[PDB]
Amino acid sequence: MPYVEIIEQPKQRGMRFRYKCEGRSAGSIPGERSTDTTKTHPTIKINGYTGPGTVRISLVTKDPPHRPHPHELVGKDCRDGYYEADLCPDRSIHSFQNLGIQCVKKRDLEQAISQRIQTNNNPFHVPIEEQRGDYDLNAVRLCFQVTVRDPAGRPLLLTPVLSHPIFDNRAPNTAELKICRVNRNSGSCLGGDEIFLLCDKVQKEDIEVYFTGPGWEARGSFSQADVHRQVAIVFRTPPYADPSLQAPVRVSMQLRRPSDRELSEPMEFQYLPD
Amino acid sequence: PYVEIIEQPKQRGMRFRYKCEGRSAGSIPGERSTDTTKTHPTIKINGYTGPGTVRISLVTKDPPHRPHPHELVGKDCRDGYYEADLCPDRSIHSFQNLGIQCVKKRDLEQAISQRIQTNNNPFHVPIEEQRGDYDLNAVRLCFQVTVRDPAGRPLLLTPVLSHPIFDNRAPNTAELKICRVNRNSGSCLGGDEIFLLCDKVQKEDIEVYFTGPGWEARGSFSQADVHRQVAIVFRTPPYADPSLQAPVRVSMQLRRPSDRELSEPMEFQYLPDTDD
């Protein structure tokens, strides 16, 4: 058979899943190369075939076995929690720009899973015995199921392909880490400089400030009481890899979730002598 | 006779509990209750001393004082109101287990219907004036005292209303509090940037208020400088004297402009400035 390739994966972090109460459509999963000058979207290329067909996109769990996910895909040409539309006969590349993730409430879990089985939404045909186990409601994968045609018009189900995982920004343990503001970004190599850091919502047991620089790994000092309402950290800076120096040296300041080694975008911190 | 509230309830700082949270309803304390001496909402009946009954219900904060969708819960409470006998020997009566159980928005109509169905409307507001927007974060207590006349007949005295009782989860009405500040001194010329961590505020209804002898000045910040309602980044105002010879102590505090409410003050020291 021909095959399906993901030319632009979905963006992993930053987007929050939206409940059904917040509207009909849930925005659009952005392409991972989406600038802001540019607005890219998840795209697939169909190799070895060009012509009519069908493309279905559904949500499966992040980890194998990739059971159907309780959450729903909503937006253009979405029904029963999955996307399904005619493949464009003229084009071999296909953009999906209206895919929103609608999260199911925890008290509607077993019913949502029932609808997956009822609608034959099971791209990897996992037995129902294993649709019993726990679901990570903060992470999904896109599953592209493309049906093409043989030379006589016989449906040809191409192998389903899984995207990178998409994480819910609603959950602070899966959200994007962002440093919004600091009272200063310079200090002495002796350390002890008090820093007030403003950040996106974090969890005080699963957070730390990560100073790095070639071959040196330091860590801001604070306690869980020094995290104010999940969105601010008051910590003391660590010493530089040299209580000496003379030169103004620049290093990296990052938030870190130890549970998954996830880093915020780096902020620059300038260690100064004396 | 007439009814007189001689200790109002405590306004701010007590949390309404949903029926889903178990009960956990609590007890409204007196307006001047302390940890050294606990006080409770207390009324005084003037012109009568004898047998009688009292009903306490919830009414809206604003006129018309319709019955509130919330419920009073606790001992001797039923159908959202309190009712029991008064003391037949004195004219001063306290109530010690009054708790406010809040109804959710989707259960609003069911609650108002129960108020009507139970004849819980002390000001007999017509059902026309009874579908407005309700403030689910503010209630008033309504005391309805029934008294005997010299004949022996129930005499319902006019209902008296308490001051508003607020949910502390509403930020427009909660107590203002400074938790952490990165700087308690700065140049008398102003302009020092300061990070302030506070309890939840509203970025459109908050100020940083510097006070002194006939002196008031405000920190400079925009709404974008308020981070998730719990952090303010502002720059200091200049002091009244741009040529200080010695540090001067002023008080710094949060302030809510819409209701003139202020947080606890905090010591800030303006310093002499050298050369800019």
Place this chain on the structure above:
DNA sequence: ACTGGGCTTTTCCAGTGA
């Protein structure tokens, strides 16, 4: 057993501004 406070889960809303 019964409250006091933080957080999570779910819902609501205002404006923005290409």
Place this chain on the structure above:
DNA sequence: TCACTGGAAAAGCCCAGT
């Protein structure tokens, strides 16, 4: 004109401690 977007508010949950 409008899904969308991000901030905020409301509803529910959970733990600790007495």
